[PDB]
Amino acid sequence: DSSRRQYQEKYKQVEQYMSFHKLPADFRQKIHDYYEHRYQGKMFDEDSILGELNGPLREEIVNFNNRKLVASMPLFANADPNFVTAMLTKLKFEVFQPGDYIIREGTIGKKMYFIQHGVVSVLTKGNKEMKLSDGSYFGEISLLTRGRRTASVRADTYSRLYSLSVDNFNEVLEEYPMMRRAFETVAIDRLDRI
Amino acid sequence: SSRRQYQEKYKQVEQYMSFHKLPADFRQKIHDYYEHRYQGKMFDEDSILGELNGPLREEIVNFNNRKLVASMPLFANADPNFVTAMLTKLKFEVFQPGDYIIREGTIGKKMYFIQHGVVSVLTKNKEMKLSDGSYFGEISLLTRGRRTASVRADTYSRLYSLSVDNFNEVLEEYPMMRRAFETVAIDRLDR
Amino acid sequence: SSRRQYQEKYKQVEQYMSFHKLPADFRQKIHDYYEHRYQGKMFDEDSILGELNGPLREEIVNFNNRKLVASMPLFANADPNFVTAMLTKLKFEVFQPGDYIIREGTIGKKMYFIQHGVVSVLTKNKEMKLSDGSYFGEISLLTRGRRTASVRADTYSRLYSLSVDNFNEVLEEYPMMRRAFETVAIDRLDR
Amino acid sequence: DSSRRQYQEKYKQVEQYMSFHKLPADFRQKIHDYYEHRYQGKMFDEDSILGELNGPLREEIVNFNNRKLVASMPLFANADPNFVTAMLTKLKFEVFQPGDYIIREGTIGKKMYFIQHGVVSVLTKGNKEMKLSDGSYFGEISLLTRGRRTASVRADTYSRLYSLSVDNFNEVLEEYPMMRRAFETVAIDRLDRI
Amino acid sequence: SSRRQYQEKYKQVEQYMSFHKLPADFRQKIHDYYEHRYQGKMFDEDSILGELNGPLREEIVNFNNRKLVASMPLFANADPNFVTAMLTKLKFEVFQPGDYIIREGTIGKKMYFIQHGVVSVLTKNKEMKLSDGSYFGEISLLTRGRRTASVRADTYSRLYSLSVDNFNEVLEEYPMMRRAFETVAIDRLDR
Amino acid sequence: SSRRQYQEKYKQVEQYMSFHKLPADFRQKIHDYYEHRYQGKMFDEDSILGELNGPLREEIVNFNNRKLVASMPLFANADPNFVTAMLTKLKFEVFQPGDYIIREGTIGKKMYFIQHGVVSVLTKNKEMKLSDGSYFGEISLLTRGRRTASVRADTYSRLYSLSVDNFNEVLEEYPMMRRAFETVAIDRLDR
Amino acid sequence: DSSRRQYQEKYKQVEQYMSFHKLPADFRQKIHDYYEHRYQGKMFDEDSILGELNGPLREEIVNFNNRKLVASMPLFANADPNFVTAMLTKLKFEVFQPGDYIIREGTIGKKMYFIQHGVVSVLTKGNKEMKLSDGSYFGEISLLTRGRRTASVRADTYSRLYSLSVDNFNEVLEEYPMMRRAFETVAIDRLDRI
Amino acid sequence: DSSRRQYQEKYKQVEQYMSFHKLPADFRQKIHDYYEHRYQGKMFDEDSILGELNGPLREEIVNFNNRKLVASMPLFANADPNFVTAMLTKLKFEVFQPGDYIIREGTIGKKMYFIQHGVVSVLTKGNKEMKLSDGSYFGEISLLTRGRRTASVRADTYSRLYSLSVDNFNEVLEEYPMMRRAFETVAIDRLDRI
Ligand SMILES: Nc1ncnc2c1ncn2[C@@H]1O[C@@H]2COP(=O)(O)O[C@H]2[C@H]1O
Ligand SMILES: Nc1ncnc2c1ncn2[C@@H]1O[C@@H]2COP(=O)(O)O[C@H]2[C@H]1O
Ligand SMILES: Nc1ncnc2c1ncn2[C@@H]1O[C@@H]2COP(=O)(O)O[C@H]2[C@H]1O
Ligand SMILES: Nc1ncnc2c1ncn2[C@@H]1O[C@@H]2COP(=O)(O)O[C@H]2[C@H]1O
Ligand SMILES: Nc1ncnc2c1ncn2[C@@H]1O[C@@H]2COP(=O)(O)O[C@H]2[C@H]1O
Ligand SMILES: Nc1ncnc2c1ncn2[C@@H]1O[C@@H]2COP(=O)(O)O[C@H]2[C@H]1O
Ligand SMILES: Nc1ncnc2c1ncn2[C@@H]1O[C@@H]2COP(=O)(O)O[C@H]2[C@H]1O
Ligand SMILES: Nc1ncnc2c1ncn2[C@@H]1O[C@@H]2COP(=O)(O)O[C@H]2[C@H]1O
Numbered sequence A, D, G, H: 001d002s003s004r005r006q007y008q009e010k011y012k013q014v015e016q017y018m019s020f021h022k023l024p025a026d027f028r029q030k031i032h033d034y035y036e037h038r039y040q041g042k043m044f045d046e047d048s049i050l051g052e053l054n055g056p057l058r059e060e061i062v063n064f065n066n067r068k069l070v071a072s073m074p075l076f077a078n079a080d081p082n083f084v085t086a087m088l089t090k091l092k093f094e095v096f097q098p099g100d101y102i103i104r105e106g107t108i109g110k111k112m113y114f115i116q117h118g119v120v121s122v123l124t125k126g127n128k129e130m131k132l133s134d135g136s137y138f139g140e141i142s143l144l145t146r147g148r149r150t151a152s153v154r155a156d157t158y159s160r161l162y163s164l165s166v167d168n169f170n171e172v173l174e175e176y177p178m179m180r181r182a183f184e185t186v187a188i189d190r191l192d193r194i
Numbered sequence B, C, E, F: 001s002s003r004r005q006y007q008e009k010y011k012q013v014e015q016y017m018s019f020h021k022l023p024a025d026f027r028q029k030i031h032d033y034y035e036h037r038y039q040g041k042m043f044d045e046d047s048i049l050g051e052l053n054g055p056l057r058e059e060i061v062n063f064n065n066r067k068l069v070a071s072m073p074l075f076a077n078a079d080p081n082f083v084t085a086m087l088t089k090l091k092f093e094v095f096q097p098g099d100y101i102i103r104e105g106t107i108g109k110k111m112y113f114i115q116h117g118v119v120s121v122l123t124k125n126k127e128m129k130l131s132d133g134s135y136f137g138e139i140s141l142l143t144r145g146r147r148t149a150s151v152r153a154d155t156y157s158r159l160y161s162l163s164v165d166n167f168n169e170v171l172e173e174y175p176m177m178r179r180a181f182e183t184v185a186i187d188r189l190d191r
Helices: A002-020 A025-039 A046-052 A055-065 A067-071 A081-090 A140-145 A166-175 A177-193 B002-019 B024-038 B045-050 B054-064 B066-071 B080-089 B138-143 B164-173 B175-190 C002-019 C024-038 C045-050 C054-064 C066-071 C080-089 C138-143 C164-173 C175-190 D002-020 D025-039 D046-052 D055-065 D067-071 D081-090 D140-145 D166-175 D177-193 E002-019 E024-038 E045-050 E054-064 E066-071 E080-089 E138-143 E164-173 E175-190 F002-019 F024-038 F045-050 F054-064 F066-071 F080-089 F138-143 F164-173 F175-190 G002-020 G025-039 G046-052 G055-065 G067-071 G081-090 G140-145 G166-175 G177-193 H002-020 H025-039 H046-052 H055-065 H067-071 H081-090 H140-145 H166-175 H177-193
Strands: A092-096 A101-103 A111-117 A120-123 A130-132 A152-155 A159-165 B091-095 B100-102 B110-116 B119-122 B128-130 B150-153 B157-163 C091-095 C100-102 C110-116 C119-122 C128-130 C150-153 C157-163 D092-096 D101-103 D111-117 D120-123 D130-132 D152-155 D159-165 E091-095 E100-102 E110-116 E119-122 E128-130 E150-153 E157-163 F091-095 F100-102 F110-116 F119-122 F128-130 F150-153 F157-163 G092-096 G101-103 G111-117 G120-123 G130-132 G152-155 G159-165 H092-096 H101-103 H111-117 H120-123 H130-132 H152-155 H159-165
Touching (some): A002 A025, A002 D002, A002 H002, A025 A092, A025 H046, A025 H055, A046 D002, A046 D025, A055 D025, A055 D101, A081 A159, A111 A140, A140 A166, A140 A177, A166 A177, A177 B138, A177 B175, B002 B024, B002 C045, B002 E002, B024 C054, B045 E002, B054 B066, B054 E100, B066 B080, B080 B164, B110 B138, B138 B164, B157 B164, C002 C024, C002 F002, C002 F045, C024 C091, C054 C066, C066 C110, C080 C157, C138 D177, C164 C175, D002 G002, D025 D092, D055 D067, D055 G025, D055 G101, D081 D166, D111 D140, D166 D177, E024 E091, E045 F002, E054 E066, E110 E164, E138 H177, E164 E175, E175 H140, F002 F024, F024 F091, F054 F066, F054 F080, F066 F080, F080 F157, F080 F164, F110 F164, F138 F164, F157 F164, F164 F175, F175 G140, F175 G177, G002 H002, G046 H002, G046 H025, G055 G081, G081 G159, G111 G140, G159 G166, H055 H067, H055 H081, H159 H166
Antiparallel strands (some): A092 A159, A101 A152, A111 A159, A120 A130, B110 B157, B119 B150, C100 C150, C110 C157, C119 C150, D111 D159, D120 D130, E091 E157, E100 E150, E119 E128, E119 E150, F100 F150, F110 F157, F119 F128, F119 F150, G101 G152, G120 G130, H092 H159, H111 H159, H120 H130, H120 H152
């Protein structure tokens, strides 16, 4: 494929970067593993392709790609499908590796995360650790309160996540103000536990 | 002396109404309002409270509004610091029977807590009544949309109003308390 | 007593004019203005209306301005809530013969509704007269451009002014009412 | 042509995207049809080409390309030609397919649309449906009032549209404030009907 | 005469407390506050200082606060223009024993300089006392974070408060003086 | 009666100075200021001018400031509408010998026009004197930089001040008048 | 050269654009002439090249390229050379063709222009026309006053100009506030004439 | 390498630029020397590569690349490692040549600089000159005070620097407000000396 070729060419550049900066062998291996998991040996100009489409098609694509995730989350499954679409269109796919701190306690929070596939651990001084998996979200509390992160969140497995920025969160909720309650209920219940 | 202050202030009202040649029934309506709102006594509340400190102002506003606070779970079951923050922002208002407190379709700049009285919520279908210990006008404040209904006083109504700016300021400090308002709004929108 | 309030307030004016050694003709001009503007009676209108509630303030402003409202299709044929929103924002002003109410080329911060009087619109060619039931100063408010003409009082003129900020605020609530002003502005610009 | 080649290369990437995400056959067909209608088998870097020009030439091009559309609309035909130019320069070409919801009732409106070629249906709860075609525009009401969309608008045919953002609408009308009346008159007449 | 002004102002307080039916102990608490805060004399300080010029206002605020200034290195060892800028912004406040001047976890809008009195800093562990010549409430102003502790008056306490906006304004002119506050904040956060 | 108003206002000053135990020499300094600033007469100028209309306020401010206007080409040779815009924004201030009107290195928030008096411009070298018909403090307003010099009153000095916000507002309407200030600033910076 | 090749490849794209939009023969000729004058048969990624440099080198380059223009203008020749550098760094090269309206009277003005090489005519209702040439600038008045353009300015010859945006004009003058007087003196003298 | 090739291709473009603008021989030599020092004969799309990664990996890379610099500066060595990471992620690598004015006295300051490797001279009217080298920073004072530059700073050797913008400086210190004191202490001590 032209896409397998693009991936190979891009990763060759990554190897040249890593050698230029004399990254240790095991570090280069970690980066290689990331690239394989994130891109699965194929690359295309996604922003370019999607930008060449129109609104309806982009919305149809994002709804199709996220079918299963949507159905597994009462947040979305039960919602106005236009709210679901507005949310989906703002999501950014990210992949984390085992051990990664996705969120660090006490920092400024600018994103939340929806778990497509993976296991993460929520870590608080007053433990023990609490796990979240497919169909859950986290990082909402800072977005709601503008306070610092209430816990750290560490990937236990390779985790395929979708992030939503605080600005995009606030934009969607300007259009669908009553959907704020869904996030607040989860946040309140979590704050009560910790 | 606050009786004298009232009588002096009302004499100025009378001279205004005379200058502008308001008809007798209207002047009587204004007289009745003044009696219900001020109860024959007036003082410069702003200057008085401004002479005090934060703790005393807060103690006073809590004492004055004990019934309001105990009347709604919103306040009764909340962080007392949230309650105090809200109370300090409330403005007392009296409405007369027939008054349109809120008009459907307009921009919403305030919500209202009912201390005593009965109002009718009017939508284009039967009127829905609200009374002591309820609030209304919250939906515009939450959504920034236009008023979803008219609200008309059925009886003399003693209300406390809260401006949209003050609502947002308090909820900046107490963000999770937004949920209490949203629950009421969602239930009402469904209905 | 509002007669006494007037006479006391005017005595303070007299002491100001004396301190600053204004010439006799100028002092007479100020005296005549005071008589026309206040008609021998004064009261703290702001404090009075501030003691009332929204409904009564709105009832009063509508009653006081019945003639103005009926005099122009702008108000006469509009949503009465738009009319009330506009009226609440109006400031009463009296001008004397020869007064330049608006100067060509300056920044426009207000428009004016004529309750009673005659003004001349002056462009660099014959003067165009406007009288009871007309308005002017709208073009700057619409365009943010400089004044297209001077406007000078021919007679004692009783006007209501509306600030650019208030104009924009009302039209935020009533966006389609902008068209009424634009139609007048376009016709005048063509002429 | 170098432009036919560019289109072919770009569409190959689109096929690789669609296969990667396992899009259904009929969905891939819909996307293929869109690409053919939107680009007509040719691609170039339009933003790059136009960006290499100067102001006068860009304005001459946009006026030429839109000759017929302009003449068919009393909005433009009767206007200051500098207003026409200012408007034209802000327009974004979009193509919609039969059945597409271009506008959904009740949502936040951030664009209006001018119809170059196509038929659309305006749909309100209090129907019946009203059709608009070449030389008409829609979506103006939200732009004027900042209220939510008063109706849905669905493409009945392949529709070649030019969108104008609310920011660009407001910018042009800052320069030509009296032209706001043209949009208001249409909006008022439509609000009276619905 | 300022004794007469005090007695008149306090009579208005009494009429307020009577209207709102405050209990006797509360009325006594308010009486005691008034005596400590105003010491039997009242004047319109704002109007008085507003009648003066900048130099005289600055001379007065420096003279009135000599003890405060000499009591802390922050002021004692600083650019006298910084000291004057700060002093002009301070608001005098009196608190009574038991008053929560600052509540932990709330939004911080002010800091406080102790002229005379003792307060307890309370954290969830033994109380830490602060007295004449110390300040508190600085940490929220620096960080924009919530209050790290409660601060409660142990004695009648005569404080000067400085708003967050005024704090930031002064430090815009005197940016390096931020370090003095930061040093105190860091030491306290470590503890 | 404005003599009575002065004497009443000054009695309140005396009670303030007594409460705060200002020393005799300082009280005398304040007394002398009051006499020079108000000349034994006081009235509520703000309320008085607020009772008038735009034309009369403008006529009054022009009449009161004829000498200032004729004394500087800045005003004397300018669009009279610019002159009026500036005058309406000026605040009268009196300074005493030795007063530091401007301190070098501080943030500049005002400039000053000399009606009557002598000031010294002080730079770290010989003092440069300015008198009737000159202005100073313009450089900070133009550049947003810190004050380039100190300016100290040598005699009792009757000045009009213009705030940086008001300066910028007027120059928004009259942009080419900025050049008059810049020419003075450039000449002074060179020197 | 790689630069002659890049130009040829880019212009081929321009021809494909022009044929796609069926531009008239004489219009295509005008565009061809523009490209030859503007780029002189060579193209490179200038923003990329300059972006690869540092501050000092960019400043040395801009000062060198504009040596002659600077010396011919008392505005710059007499100024703080750091002011000259700050101004030069914000300038955008543009080329106009004979007959082009560079500025139209009555419009909102967002740029001024410095003439490197060319002749333009300033046109006012109260004429006659006034010519400006190498080393002059125009369009300053709107930038100073925020008023509408006081005249039209039309290129009489091929004109090689440098534009300066109102934002960039205001930025430079924040750093060098006393240099505002130079522009004001020219503006005042011109307003007096017209 | 693909990276050596990219560098060669890019530098060929630079030569074509320099010849087009007829830059003097010694000037072209200075630019050549800069390119060799800055890029060391290799080029890749660094922003592209780093943008393809996730947060954790970018942070691991920046921490690794800057190991030695961090350890040599009590500012960082002693700090919350999350503060160090936040700072590092905002830094921009720049290379200056002997004689370059990195900062000019009296100008508006929008950046500060950390010295990775090089010697610079701080120059004040009230001299003499003061040198700073590896592990030092400069330009902090304008960032703290918003005043004009208090001195000029000139590179004595080839200097490998990391710049931090005023906006990025203020952003990091919003998250770590007490770290402002470290910069203030250095600034105060320097202002006392000059
Ligand atoms: N008890 C809990 N159970 C599950 N998740 C939690 C719990 N407490 C906190 N979290 C999550 O951890 C996140 C840390 O970042 P935030 O505080 O922004 O949002 C927090 C929640 O999403
Ligand atoms: N079904 C309902 N029952 C009670 N109150 C309502 C109902 N619907 C609307 N309201 C109230 O009427 C108010 C009208 O103004 P708001 O839309 O701001 O907020 C609305 C609610 O507070
Ligand atoms: N031909 C005209 N007839 C009546 N009034 C006019 C005419 N031209 C201008 N005006 C008014 O004069 C006003 C001067 O200020 P404005 O430009 O703000 O608004 C202008 C109009 O209201
Ligand atoms: N009666 C009507 N006839 C034609 N178009 C309409 C009518 N009513 C609404 N529309 C259009 O449908 C659009 C829906 O989005 P807007 O409300 O922004 O703008 C609306 C109008 O452009
Ligand atoms: N260990 C301490 N010793 C003295 N004062 C403290 C200590 N910890 C906190 N404080 C003060 O208590 C204040 C509570 O409000 P702030 O967090 O704004 O600022 C805090 C400090 O001024
Ligand atoms: N050489 C000079 N002659 C007269 N006045 C000066 C001179 N230098 C500075 N000033 C004035 O002193 C003022 C001090 O404050 P500013 O810098 O704002 O503006 C300055 C000028 O108005
Ligand atoms: N008399 C004149 N001589 C030369 N140039 C002029 C004259 N009048 C106007 N201009 C220029 O024409 C420009 C038109 O746009 P601006 O008004 O922004 O700025 C104007 C001046 O630069
Ligand atoms: N005495 C000094 N020793 C070392 N560096 C200095 C000294 N004085 C000034 N500098 C640096 O030179 C910089 C010039 O720009 P800034 O004023 O922004 O910040 C200044 C300091 O970082």
